[PDB]
Design an enzyme around this catalytic site. Structure first.
Site, PDB file in Angstrom:
ATOM      1  N   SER A 185       0.867  -1.176   0.000  1.00  0.00           N
ATOM      2  CA  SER A 185       0.000   0.000   0.000  1.00  0.00           C
ATOM      3  C   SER A 185       0.905   1.228   0.000  1.00  0.00           C
ATOM      4  O   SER A 185       1.145   1.865   1.029  1.00  0.00           O
ATOM      5  CB  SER A 185      -0.934  -0.033   1.203  1.00  0.00           C
ATOM      6  N   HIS A 214      -2.632  -6.394   2.805  1.00  0.00           N
ATOM      7  CA  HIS A 214      -1.670  -7.357   3.335  1.00  0.00           C
ATOM      8  C   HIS A 214      -2.238  -8.752   3.527  1.00  0.00           C
ATOM      9  O   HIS A 214      -1.510  -9.630   4.002  1.00  0.00           O
ATOM     10  CB  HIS A 214      -1.130  -6.877   4.677  1.00  0.00           C
ATOM     11  N   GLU A 233      -4.221  -2.785   9.536  1.00  0.00           N
ATOM     12  CA  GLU A 233      -3.422  -3.286  10.651  1.00  0.00           C
ATOM     13  C   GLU A 233      -4.134  -3.065  11.974  1.00  0.00           C
ATOM     14  O   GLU A 233      -4.535  -1.936  12.285  1.00  0.00           O
ATOM     15  CB  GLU A 233      -2.036  -2.612  10.688  1.00  0.00           C
ATOM     16  N   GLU A 242       2.370  -9.585   7.173  1.00  0.00           N
ATOM     17  CA  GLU A 242       3.172  -9.105   8.289  1.00  0.00           C
ATOM     18  C   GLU A 242       3.099 -10.039   9.488  1.00  0.00           C
ATOM     19  O   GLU A 242       3.471  -9.649  10.597  1.00  0.00           O
ATOM     20  CB  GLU A 242       2.765  -7.687   8.674  1.00  0.00           C
ATOM     21  N   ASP A 278      -3.632   0.965  11.839  1.00  0.00           N
ATOM     22  CA  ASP A 278      -3.276   1.544  10.546  1.00  0.00           C
ATOM     23  C   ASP A 278      -4.449   1.249   9.613  1.00  0.00           C
ATOM     24  O   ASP A 278      -4.628   0.118   9.158  1.00  0.00           O
ATOM     25  CB  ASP A 278      -1.958   1.000   9.995  1.00  0.00           C
ATOM     26  N   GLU A 320      -3.256   5.524  12.399  1.00  0.00           N
ATOM     27  CA  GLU A 320      -2.393   5.856  11.273  1.00  0.00           C
ATOM     28  C   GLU A 320      -3.209   5.879   9.986  1.00  0.00           C
ATOM     29  O   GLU A 320      -4.056   5.010   9.766  1.00  0.00           O
ATOM     30  CB  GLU A 320      -1.247   4.852  11.142  1.00  0.00           C
ATOM     31  N   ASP A 331       1.212   8.470   7.227  1.00  0.00           N
ATOM     32  CA  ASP A 331       2.099   7.543   6.525  1.00  0.00           C
ATOM     33  C   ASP A 331       2.151   7.958   5.055  1.00  0.00           C
ATOM     34  O   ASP A 331       3.054   8.702   4.647  1.00  0.00           O
ATOM     35  CB  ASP A 331       1.615   6.090   6.717  1.00  0.00           C
ATOM     36  N   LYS A 367       9.643   5.708   7.136  1.00  0.00           N
ATOM     37  CA  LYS A 367       9.975   4.591   6.241  1.00  0.00           C
ATOM     38  C   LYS A 367      11.129   5.043   5.361  1.00  0.00           C
ATOM     39  O   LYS A 367      10.925   5.849   4.448  1.00  0.00           O
ATOM     40  CB  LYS A 367       8.790   4.196   5.362  1.00  0.00           C
ATOM     41  N   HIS A 419       8.721  -0.765   9.435  1.00  0.00           N
ATOM     42  CA  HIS A 419       9.012  -1.705   8.359  1.00  0.00           C
ATOM     43  C   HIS A 419       8.164  -1.372   7.121  1.00  0.00           C
ATOM     44  O   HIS A 419       7.313  -0.471   7.133  1.00  0.00           O
ATOM     45  CB  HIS A 419       8.713  -3.130   8.837  1.00  0.00           C
ATOM     46  N   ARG A 420       8.380  -2.121   6.038  1.00  0.00           N
ATOM     47  CA  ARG A 420       7.383  -2.280   4.983  1.00  0.00           C
ATOM     48  C   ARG A 420       6.793  -3.681   5.056  1.00  0.00           C
ATOM     49  O   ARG A 420       7.342  -4.591   5.683  1.00  0.00           O
ATOM     50  CB  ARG A 420       7.956  -2.079   3.571  1.00  0.00           C
ATOM     51  N   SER A 421       5.681  -3.863   4.346  1.00  0.00           N
ATOM     52  CA  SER A 421       5.042  -5.167   4.339  1.00  0.00           C
ATOM     53  C   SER A 421       5.878  -6.189   3.577  1.00  0.00           C
ATOM     54  O   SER A 421       5.791  -7.389   3.861  1.00  0.00           O
ATOM     55  CB  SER A 421       3.636  -5.053   3.752  1.00  0.00           C
ATOM     56  N   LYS A 453       7.200   0.082  14.617  1.00  0.00           N
ATOM     57  CA  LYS A 453       6.167  -0.738  13.991  1.00  0.00           C
ATOM     58  C   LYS A 453       6.901  -1.713  13.075  1.00  0.00           C
ATOM     59  O   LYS A 453       7.386  -1.324  12.007  1.00  0.00           O
ATOM     60  CB  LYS A 453       5.171   0.112  13.213  1.00  0.00           C
TER      61      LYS A 453
HETATM   62  O1  LIG Z   1       1.286   1.020   5.379  1.00  0.00           O
HETATM   63  C1  LIG Z   1       2.253   0.696   6.138  1.00  0.00           C
HETATM   64  O2  LIG Z   1       2.460   1.330   7.203  1.00  0.00           O
HETATM   65  C2  LIG Z   1       3.220  -0.443   5.758  1.00  0.00           C
HETATM   66  C3  LIG Z   1       3.791  -1.194   6.971  1.00  0.00           C
HETATM   67  O3  LIG Z   1       2.855  -1.966   7.679  1.00  0.00           O
HETATM   68  O4  LIG Z   1       2.657  -1.325   4.828  1.00  0.00           O
HETATM   69  P1  LIG Z   1       3.209  -1.134   3.308  1.00  0.00           P
HETATM   70  O5  LIG Z   1       4.701  -1.415   3.369  1.00  0.00           O
HETATM   71  O6  LIG Z   1       2.539  -2.149   2.405  1.00  0.00           O
HETATM   72  O7  LIG Z   1       3.009   0.306   2.859  1.00  0.00           O
HETATM   73 MG   LIG Z   2       1.110   1.369   3.107  1.00  0.00          MG
HETATM   74 MG   LIG Z   3       0.775   2.620   6.911  1.00  0.00          MG
END
Ligand SMILES: O=C(O)[C@@H](CO)OP(=O)(O)O
Ligand SMILES: [Mg+2]
Ligand SMILES: [Mg+2]
Ligand SMILES: O=C(O)[C@@H](CO)OP(=O)(O)O
Ligand SMILES: [Mg+2]
Ligand SMILES: [Mg+2]
Lengths: 424, 423
Positions: free
Chosen positions: A45, A158, A167, A208, A245, A288, A315, A340, A368-370, A391
């Site tokens: 995402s 996810h 999340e 995750e 999230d 979030e 985010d 990130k 992290h990322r997913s 996170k």
């Molecule tokens: O949205 C988020 O915060 C991330 C981490 O959980 O997911 P994604 O890396 O897919 O953006």
């Molecule tokens: Mg995302």
């Molecule tokens: Mg996010």
């Protein structure tokens, strides 16, 4: 001698991330033979303004997701630009990388090529100094062991389930130290597995490491987490609180937010009311991406109405980008930022975002990322930044547990406090 | 002098299922530090070496390993400080003699193995050589063919699947990076195949999808459909391997295939495998019969051993004394190599050499509870065993091993085992 921090060679390779898609790993070799290594995570995402994740788009290789072009940029342009330069000065190396790419969004070399280099240089620097990475990353902030927000029920982009919120997280804010915080979250995770199984709900896991059941409503998910917390012997509020999230940019379409699982669609005003009602029913301390990345008027309303009661994390709203965060601060939108490194592409720019947030009363959540790798950089960066919140996933899958384990290693000799309830 | 031990210490970390396990750091007098962590099984054989846990219900539902950690920090450190990591056999001897029990139930096989592997890494760092190079004991090294468990069942998933592991093997790839690419592409296509049929694509413990299935034949049909849609050829490009983990199905004289509403005596289950092999390019069956079904294993080996690889896992638990007896009785023709089933690198090497000396193949294996440790990648290459079993193509507990094989492949200049594993 300080010439011992000079770069001899930079190279890269294609590896697999935790979803099975290619990503990039870089090795920075100094003239002493010391090698710094780092690999780059990948989101699902993703915000529309994230820095360019360069992929090959070759349909015959990994369904278009190869990263050989980014690898080639490390091996050629980047190696040649940085050979002979010192890794001791992170700001200078990152400046040269951005100037080499010479595009606003790192779309020439790829933010993944640039970040792999940036982080591998930081590790080569730490090795040269013969100091733990988290120590060499600190820029004067008081370091703490962070409170983890642990995503133990996955949804949205996810997971293969009907869950709209991306999340559902528990936070062991009441733990005395980080090892016990990890123990509390782990024990709740295993109890939740039993709670779901007893109800015939799916306990296979999403990206995750959180369980991926179908749910009747978002309140049911929070009820299931509450039941597991109670059965694990812990207290809602005093020991454990919730974080969400929503990833609401994924739910926004044609001027409305769609909670398909509940056959509900909300305008921004209605969705703010929805969050206010959730917060009055459950100890949710952080939300979030409650609204879409472009819904700046909604985010301002959300911040005015609920920002005194709850942490509001941007985010996709900010994409770890100092220029966007600056405008958000000026407009009074959100009160925290999700950090990130691969949304922006360099350690130095990530540090700019952290500093801008601290200087203006915003909290930072290291993330992290997913799509993760075995790289644990964010554990060291979370401690070093003193952000107090991390996170990095559920309590299964080594793409997540490796970060928790690295925090355990740091805690061993760091003699640092646990951020605990100070994050409120 | 650079290989002498200064200090050994351990710590409790989390494995990939969320359960505590042990990690050890061996510090030499030069300051070089070797580190290793220990995996943990779910479907464990009854004769595996002792995984020592704390059994404190207040911590991790009884699954802490602070007792094993304490055994490393105290007994093991005191016994080994001053000694050299250059002689792996000597260190492992000293650890086993210190424990002084047949099954390593005093110190814990997890305490002993963490030390054994950490010492191996400290030795490799001392030689300034890649780990796989320092592990080779004369065998011709190859990049192994991976058997990739992309549909999980049994003890590893919350679904109705009885067979524990449905694996693809990219035996027809020209090299290891392309082999990994083929398996990965098939994995993602299988996700789309399952989604289109309304089957679950969340994953089990080893990263394979965890759908419910009508039958084992349907599972193989679904894998076949994904292989074809990914553009690869059954037999020529991709073949199948199974880990039935049949000890988990065996009860009261019968093997229970609950998903197919049928039970089998040993004779009937051998026939069942014969019919599966005639319908699908299955080249390997692991633990097709119970760990105690020694007459069934003999019959299975006589009847199908010339047609298919027959891998003993719980049958042998990486134990040289048990494998020696199995060889003498003519049972199985391969062994699954799990370092933590026996507890030392040296005893693991004894099992490998015994298998090699008697024409058995070795399959280097993960556990379903993994860590970030990639030792089995280096050991698979160094042993020249030619086959590795280390998971599906998602979850870093699995992909980290594939990534380490990619790193070894860069400068190793080694052949890919390929179809030679069939000879
Ligand atoms: O949205 C988020 O915060 C991330 C981490 O959980 O997911 P994604 O890396 O897919 O953006
Ligand atoms: Mg995302
Ligand atoms: Mg996010
Ligand atoms: O049976 C096996 O071969 C292993 C690896 O897949 O599983 P477990 O670690 O649970 O014994
Ligand atoms: Mg097993
Ligand atoms: Mg097995």
């Amino acid at each position: 001698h300080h010439h011992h921090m000079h770069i001899h060679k930079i190279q890269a390779r294609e590896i697999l991330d935790s979803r099975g898609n290619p990503t990039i790993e870089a090795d920075v070799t100094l003239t002493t033979g010391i090698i710094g290594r780092a690999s780059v995570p990948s989101g699902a995402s993703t915000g529309s303004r994230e820095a360019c994740e360069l992929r090959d788009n070759d349909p015959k290789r990994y369904a278009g997701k190869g990263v050989q072009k980014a690898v080639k940029h490390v091996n050629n342009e980047i190696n040649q630009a940085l050979q002979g330069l010192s890794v001791e000065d992170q700001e200078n190396l990152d400046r040269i990388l951005c100037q080499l790419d010479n595009t606003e969004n790192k779309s020439h070399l790829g933010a993944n090529a640039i970040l792999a280099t940036s982080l591998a240089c930081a590790r080569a620097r730490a090795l040269s100094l013969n100091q733990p990475l988290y120590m060499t990353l600190n820029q004067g902030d008081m370091m703490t062991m962070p409170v983890p927000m642990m995503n133990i029920l996955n949804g949205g982009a996810h997971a293969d389930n009907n869950v709209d919120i991306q999340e559902f997280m528990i936070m062991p804010i009441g733990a005395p130290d980080f090892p016990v915080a990890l123990q509390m979250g782990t024990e709740i995770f295993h109890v939740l597995k039993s709670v779901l199984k007893k109800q015939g709900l799916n306990t296979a896991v999403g990206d995750e490491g959180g369980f991926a059941p179908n749910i009747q409503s978002n309140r049911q998910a929070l009820d299931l987490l509450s039941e597991a917390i109670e059965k694990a012997g812990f207290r809602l509020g005093e020991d454990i609180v919730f974080a969400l999230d929503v990833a609401a940019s994924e739910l926004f379409n044609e001027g409305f937010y769609h909670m398909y699982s509940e056959n509900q669609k909300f305008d921004s005003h209605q969705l703010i009311e929805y969050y206010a009602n959730l917060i009055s029913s459950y100890p949710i301390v952080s939300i979030e991406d409650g609204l879409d990345e472009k819904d700046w008027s909604g985010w301002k309303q959300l911040t005015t109405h609920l920002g005194n009661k709850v942490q509001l994390v941007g985010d996709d709203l900010f994409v770890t980008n100092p220029k966007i965060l600056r405008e958000g601060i000026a407009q009074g939108i959100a009160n925290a930022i999700l950090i990130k490194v691969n949304q922006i592409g360099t350690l130095s720019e990530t540090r700019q975002a952290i500093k801008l947030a601290y200087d203006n009363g915003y909290r930072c959540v290291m993330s992290h990322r997913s799509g993760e790798t075995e790289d644990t950089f964010i554990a060291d960066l979370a401690v070093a930044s003193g952000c107090g919140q991390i996170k990095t996933g559920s309590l299964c899958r080594t793409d997540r547990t490796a970060k928790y384990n690295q925090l355990l290693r740091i805690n061993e000799l760091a003699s640092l406090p646990y951020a605990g309830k100070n994050i409120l």
